[PDB]
Design a protein around this ligand. Structure first.
Ligand code: HEM
Ligand code: HEM
Ligand SMILES: N#Cc1ccc(CCNCc2ccc3ccc(N)nc3c2)cc1
Ligand SMILES: N#Cc1ccc(CCNCc2ccc3ccc(N)nc3c2)cc1
Ligand SMILES: C[C@H](O)[C@H](O)[C@H]1CNc2nc(N)[nH]c(=O)c2N1
Ligand SMILES: C[C@H](O)[C@H](O)[C@H]1CNc2nc(N)[nH]c(=O)c2N1
Ligand SMILES: [Zn+2]
Lengths: 406, 404
């Protein structure tokens, strides 16, 4: 009937339609000929900018119920005149707040979006040095960590400016363990971070040799080389991993940090580009227990734990991988709880995201969602989102990926 | 144009150029991706074009392209469509087509096996009774006392203005789902509609959780007929856990033969509306989906209580623990009963190998990531970390409306 994507939940039998997708301005990677949905990273003119700026201003006035108003039309003339003279324009404070929240809300790969309204936005568009970026970041970490009672936050630094260098945080997260390529070809620490480790070295960091060494920050102010800042340890809250009944698990000496703070994503709002705008939430347990600790190309501790558990690792059909993986996820949850550090398991998360989808069905007529990223990397069909069809598309405001500064 | 496909565990990159041979639209557009939808939303030069292409494929497959036999076959097909609006396949072509359809199936994790498929031509079938006989033979062959073998039986093609040969059942072996009026369901809830159709067509129902249904076979433009499968034809495996002696007491069992019977087989424009095929199970299908899915037998909590776990909360991963033991139970049981089965680790490991064979052979391989990654332990398998391109090649298995 409706000229919109019919969406089905196969557990409950319920149908919805997505009308929100009709608001999408940007093409994704798919075509009638092939679906490229499983690719991680698939491949201004004042006219262009203005149309984006206008669209965002309309989104904004809509959210405060003043679409059509004198303040709405005036704001548009203001933005247009601003672009007409400077090539760019600037956002008001509450516009930046609404956009930051809307970029999160629009993020198709994020299962934590039920929280999208509770996002603390720190304005740091006054920042003029790399030392200043460090203070803001430290403040963010302090506020967001909150002694283990975690709080979603983002800190926004100056936007891209015509003929001027970006503000860039070089690291992909604010907190990252070092990756040390060994002489025997192997890697000590986190293999994910070999390149950022070597970059920190080339820039004069005296490197450690642990499995869990916190990297310094490489902060870059416009038209200047990156400077190096070492985070004070007490600011970086960590959780030692023990298991609730496997007494030896604590002896493995594994740990993870409390705060997931992504720092290399571009925040786009109304055609304005914020190249440095780190944000943080809290972890879902499988991020640590499954991806970071058990990916072959990460810590890859699955065999280790499996041996300690005395499993038959010579054969797939023992499900020793599945067994070990559970106990690692359980230990992540148990330790974070014990340490009173905010964390959510993948059942509780996906349940909360089903409620999110229902909220947005009413609120906006749909929700852009990446099924491959929303389903957890363990126990997939045991969570309710596995049985939920999803429609994926790009809305703006948006968190976008951006090429590495070097 | 050509997609860059990356494996994120190994850093390896391929380029799918096989996709450029796709003549059929998928659900996606540049504006929104609809990859997660389970089903699709909804002259004679057309048929002749698909007909030539397939013939072209066939004669290339046997390295005999441009030959006299190739040229003659094209004229035969062309002459037959011109005169009758349709044509027929030679058995050898059919064998080829059916294999290519399996090979092209983007959702199938078991395609390493594609070239090894026993094809039964049943296009000379003319009644429900004959359909039944062909089905019994397929089951006997394919089951092979537990050493499962992959077979397809192909019934007569659809014809303009005539009913289709159909098997109403989705699989040749389904368990009855009896709707107890108190909301609940006894048996497999996935099979409520089909179980009702059977009773209204005169089947005497049971009152059990694992009651094998009869088949409803329909010869064209006739009411479907009811056929009970001889109990000895339906091989089944009682489930017991290797260390939890209390598991067998749950009275759990599953059948050995996964035979899908409601998909349409399309080869060279011709359509085969009844072409049940079968292989062997991947353990997670039974252990995770069929037994643990909420809208199926839904045994997770039950098992979890007998393991004395904390149902009170999610953070205890009781669901994940119970599921792992259920999957273990299934693998153990089947291996103990000497019935063919593949775990999700072995299966995805062979699929990787398959993608590689395919990359060398055709320059790509259509794969549905959401369907290739198993329902548990996703990232613990190599296919999770592999990018995939999805598209529609022909010959192809398709979905089709239920014939009622
Ligand atoms: C509040 C608790 C949160 C939870 C539990 C959560 C959970 C997750 C998880 C598990 C992922 C998958 C990422 C991966 O596997 O690499 C994700 C993705 C994402 N999250 Fe959230 N998130 C939270 C908060 C936030 C916040 C505050 C923001 C920004 C304002 C945000 C923005 C995003 C974006 C843009 C992605 C896409 C990842 C990418 O494309 O690289 N999330 N989230
Ligand atoms: C030999 C062992 C085989 C294994 C282990 C296997 C495995 C699987 C699995 C696990 C699925 C996912 C199904 C689901 O979860 O609903 C699937 C799908 C599929 N398989 Fe295979 N398969 C095998 C043989 C075959 C054969 C012989 C054929 C046909 C000739 C075939 C054709 C298909 C098709 C068309 C799908 C798509 C399912 C759908 O969308 O309904 N497979 N396979
Ligand atoms: N190249 C590359 C490449 C590598 C990893 C990713 C995924 C990184 N996502 C990390 C991420 C981002 C935001 C998050 C928000 C909350 C949370 N708990 N985890 C979060 C995790 C994408 C591209
Ligand atoms: N409507 C609907 C609808 C519901 C479920 C499915 C999935 C059916 N696929 C089952 C299936 C198909 C082929 C298989 C081949 C081998 C195997 N071991 N299992 C197999 C299982 C499709 C459409
Ligand atoms: C190849 C595949 O697209 C890739 O590994 C994806 C799959 N799903 C994911 N899902 C989440 N949440 N995070 C990820 O990094 C990925 N990676
Ligand atoms: C909506 C979602 O795509 C749907 O549940 C899919 C996901 N992946 C699947 N994968 C397999 N193998 N079988 C399935 O039925 C499904 N279901
Ligand atoms: Zn797509």
């Amino acid at each position: 009937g409706p000229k919109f994507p019919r969406v089905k939940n196969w557990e409950l039998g319920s149908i919805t339609y997505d009308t929100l997708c009709a608001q999408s301005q940007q093409d994704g990677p798919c075509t009638p000929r092939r679906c490229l949905g499983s690719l991680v990273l698939p491949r201004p003119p004042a006219e262009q900018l203005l149309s984006q700026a206008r669209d965002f201003i309309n989104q904004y006035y809509s959210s405060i119920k003043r679409s059509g108003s004198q303040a709405h039309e005036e704001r548009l003339q203001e933005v247009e005149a601003e672009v007409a003279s400077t090539g760019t324009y600037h956002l008001r404070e509450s516009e930046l707040v609404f956009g930051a929240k809307q970029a999160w809300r629009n993020a198709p790969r994020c299962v934590g979006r039920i929280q999208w309204g509770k996002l603390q936005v720190f304005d740091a568009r006054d920042c003029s040095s790399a030392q200043e970026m460090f203070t803001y970041i430290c403040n963010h970490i302090k506020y967001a960590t909150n002694r283990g009672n975690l709080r979603s936050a983002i800190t926004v630094f100056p936007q891209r400016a015509p003929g001027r260098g970006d503000f860039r945080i070089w690291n992909s997260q604010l907190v990252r363990y070092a990756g040390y390529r060994q002489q025997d070809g192997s890697v000590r620490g986190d293999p994910a971070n070999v390149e950022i480790t070597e970059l920190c070295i080339q820039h004069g960091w005296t490197p450690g040799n642990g499995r869990f060494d916190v990297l310094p920050l490489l902060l870059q102010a416009p038209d200047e080389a990156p400077e190096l800042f070492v985070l004070p340890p007490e600011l970086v809250l960590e959780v030692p991993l023990e298991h609730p009944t496997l007494e030896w698990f604590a002896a493995l000496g594994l740990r993870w940090y409390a705060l997931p703070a992504v720092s290399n994503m571009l925040l786009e709002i109304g055609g304005l580009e914020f190249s440095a705008a780190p944000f943080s939430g809290w972890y879902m347990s499988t991020e640590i227990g499954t991806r970071n600790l058990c990916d072959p190309h990460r810590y890859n501790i699955l065999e280790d734990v499996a041996v300690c558990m005395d499993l038959d690792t010579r054969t797939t059909s023992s499900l020793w991988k599945d067994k070990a993986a559970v106990e690692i996820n359980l230990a992540v949850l148990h330790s974070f709880q014990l340490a009173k550090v905010t964390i959510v398991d993948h059942h509780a998360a996906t349940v909360s995201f089903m409620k999110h989808l229902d909220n947005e069905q009413k609120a906006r007529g749909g929700c852009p969602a990446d099924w491959a990223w929303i389903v957890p990397p363990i126990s997939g069909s045991l969570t309710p989102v596995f049985h939920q069809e999803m429609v994926n598309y790009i809305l703006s405001p948006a968190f976008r990926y951006q090429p590495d500064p070097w």
